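User: Modeling request: complex.
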Amino acid sequence: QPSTANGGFPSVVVTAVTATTSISPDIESTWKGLLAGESGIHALEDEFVTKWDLAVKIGGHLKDPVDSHMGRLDMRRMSYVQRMGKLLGGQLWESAGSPEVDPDRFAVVVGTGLGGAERIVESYDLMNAGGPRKVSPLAVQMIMPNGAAAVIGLQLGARAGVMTPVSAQSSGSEAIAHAWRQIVMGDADVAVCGGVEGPIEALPIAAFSMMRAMSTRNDEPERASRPFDKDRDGFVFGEAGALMLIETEEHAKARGAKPLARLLGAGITSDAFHMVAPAADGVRAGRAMTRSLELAGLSPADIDHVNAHGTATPIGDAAEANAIRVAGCDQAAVYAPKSALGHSIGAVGALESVLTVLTLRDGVIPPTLNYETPDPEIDLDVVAGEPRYGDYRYAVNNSFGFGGHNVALAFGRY
Amino acid sequence: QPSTANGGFPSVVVTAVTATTSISPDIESTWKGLLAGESGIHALEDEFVTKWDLAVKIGGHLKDPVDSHMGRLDMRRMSYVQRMGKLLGGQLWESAGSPEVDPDRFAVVVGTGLGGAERIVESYDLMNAGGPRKVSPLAVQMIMPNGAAAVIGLQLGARAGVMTPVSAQSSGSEAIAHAWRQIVMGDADVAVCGGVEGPIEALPIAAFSMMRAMSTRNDEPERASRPFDKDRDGFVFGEAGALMLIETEEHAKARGAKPLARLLGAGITSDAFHMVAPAADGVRAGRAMTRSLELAGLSPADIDHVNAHGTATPIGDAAEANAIRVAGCDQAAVYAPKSALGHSIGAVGALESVLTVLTLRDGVIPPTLNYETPDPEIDLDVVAGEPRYGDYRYAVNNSFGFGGHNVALAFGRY
Ligand SMILES: CCCCCCCCCCCCCCCC(=O)O[C@H](COC(=O)CCCCCCCC[C@H](C)CCCCCCCC)COP(=O)(O)O
Ligand SMILES: CCCCCCCCCCCCCCCC(=O)O[C@H](COC(=O)CCCCCCCC[C@H](C)CCCCCCCC)COP(=O)(O)O
Ligand SMILES: C=C/C(C)=C/[C@@]1(C)SC(=O)C(CC)=C1O
Ligand SMILES: C=C/C(C)=C/[C@@]1(C)SC(=O)C(CC)=C1O
Ligand SMILES: [K+]
Ligand SMILES: [K+]
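Assistant: Request completed. Predicted assembly structure:
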């Protein structure tokens, strides 16, 4: 059976990354910030918080708002996720050296949680006020959830497929999994992949808050997200979008690109347990990890590092600790970046895959913030207090989503 | 290089199909109907048409509304596409003999155009009227576009992955493409796949009609949808959802299921041309067809039948005829089912895949309705007037979507 290690699949490398976060618009500054123990979570100053007296009054807005880079027409012709996709798509390509690739071998796979939903409600209000001729001729193509991926495909010229897998909070990792599949199956040699997501707003907070699993530690925003900690009280929103460029090792060599890491395998499963709670036993989630190992050609003892989904929900963290044990990876050093960056939903799995890549490139895992009281039921090696340094050779990035979706990505040091 | 024909991919068979359409809730009755020249397209009698004086006053509502089957609890706690998913998934599973499969080898892949969007505008109105605590605690899990796929995965017990590819009008076929990939790569032995979509409503009609591509032949509804006809004047909505059950031929034989057809190969590409117009040259669209043949182990000369996306827009049908030529498939017999069933957006490529399968099972292509004046730019063998019987062995189903997505599926007689 084919694996990366046994040459049954071609070698695929990560050759550029871009991300915008609550800490910085520059991924390399976000990364230094994380290492120095910086949090992007703050008191929400938005008017909408006082207008509605929201129970949740914390979150990380992007340091550098997407729309400060958007012109007059982009504001009127794209939904917010498409605007983010355009912004990141251009930054990534510039970071890659603006390569001239064969368009017929270039694919885009970009996940998102929802799509251009603000244009749904705008279109609804416009029609209710002034009838059907007040709806934009662009409303369909701004709203459709494949919109951000399609904007990036058009921007960069991708003709080997533009795909948008949606799996709620695992969408941004799932996208990279499908990009890797498309290359190893011979449909593409190069792919831009990742995840984008909307900003923090009143209605999203209201709707997630009614499920009662958001932190309300409003007095102390930077202490509120505590994945794996005994005193965790739910997740915190933190805005992000992130993309990476992956290509065959041969394609990278031929153009002189310097790889940051290798993308070795990907595992996708599903729980069939509950729509909005993960299976407590972590068995299908652990199988996604295992399947990424099988495809990579690795054993669980090879894994130095797991980048946890680690939302800081009580039931979420417990299930993931069980999954990591089921996969044999519970001696890896674990990071839960939502501790500092919060949860960006459809993008978050892409951001964390980027962080996994930087961990491998630089030999360092940032501290998990707020990890102050270990939880007996979670017996994991959670990195905390200061960075953990090592010559890491292999890591797995985990992401999970409402629906019972489990995605695991195996990366290696280049 | 592995193909189905050369045994490099495992054999994959279609063992059950279900669909609900404008003609019938029973796919076998829908099929008999199409063969008898029936149309599902009628005057819209909804009060919203006259309320808003909509330019488009025609379309095909389901013969049998999904909600005639829906418990009162479901009507509050699932979105419309989730209800459609649950209904179709239970029907499919019964049609299959309710098999006991290994859940850890069973995947679901179901596309849709948008998701539970009615719950977005419901949540918005509730919050505006009553504040943030009047939003449903189930709002998120009803809205998320992976919701329908996830309902089906929970309902049927799928633990090998639940996926929702979103590619607007090609989603339904793209879902079946990714299910075939998942089986041939060894991630699953059996999969439920296809597409669901919302109903014709006021805001959907306004937003699409403002793009200026819909038919407004309101005085003759059954004559409005005219794919490939010289006098075509745009597309017509017709509601549907459809699912099929695919599995390895070995798995089928083990349980004694008689196949309906073989699913031989799939190709996905993208245009990088325009967000809402297909590339005129048909080149990337023809490459998707060619890719499906390469993976099948077929040559264009083998192909007997093409089930065309055939929307009846002037530019869309012209581009598809060029793509069929690019692919070398322009000697095949062509059917354009939107002539009879109209356009079901995210569900349509799955519906048309099911029709392709029945064509191969029964050796007959239904007539393309309203095909009265050949267009010299098309120069295709369009089946029309009466059904055409023949010994069809191989067929390609086309679907394309806003964003420039091209999906082709290669099917074969069992
Ligand atoms: C990290 C946060 C993650 C967020 C959660 C993800 C949810 C998806 C986010 C959707 C995209 C939102 C885009 C907002 C653009 C923007 O900002 O529009 C403001 C003005 O507000 C609005 O129009 C708010 C309109 C909201 C649109 C409907 C959202 C409905 C959300 C659902 C009820 C709950 C969330 C469902 C998530 C399902 C999928 C993931 C599991 C500019 O203001 P002005 O400049 O005009 O003054
Ligand atoms: C032939 C298929 C047509 C496909 C069209 C696809 C459009 C997308 C699918 C939308 C799914 C909506 C489900 C409808 C539920 C239903 O019916 O609720 C009515 C009462 O009205 C409503 O609340 C309708 C309000 C709809 C609000 C959101 C619609 C947003 C539409 C966008 C602005 C334009 C379409 C975007 C498509 C992008 C994706 C594909 C390219 C019954 O009322 P009651 O009898 O129960 O009292
Ligand atoms: C099946 C449900 C799952 C996986 C739920 C998780 C663990 S995933 C996620 O991001 C969150 C917080 C938003 C959960 O509560
Ligand atoms: C890129 C745009 C494309 C492929 C557009 C097509 C041809 S596909 C489709 O179903 C329709 C009618 C709604 C189109 O107008
Ligand atoms: K992670
Ligand atoms: K078709």
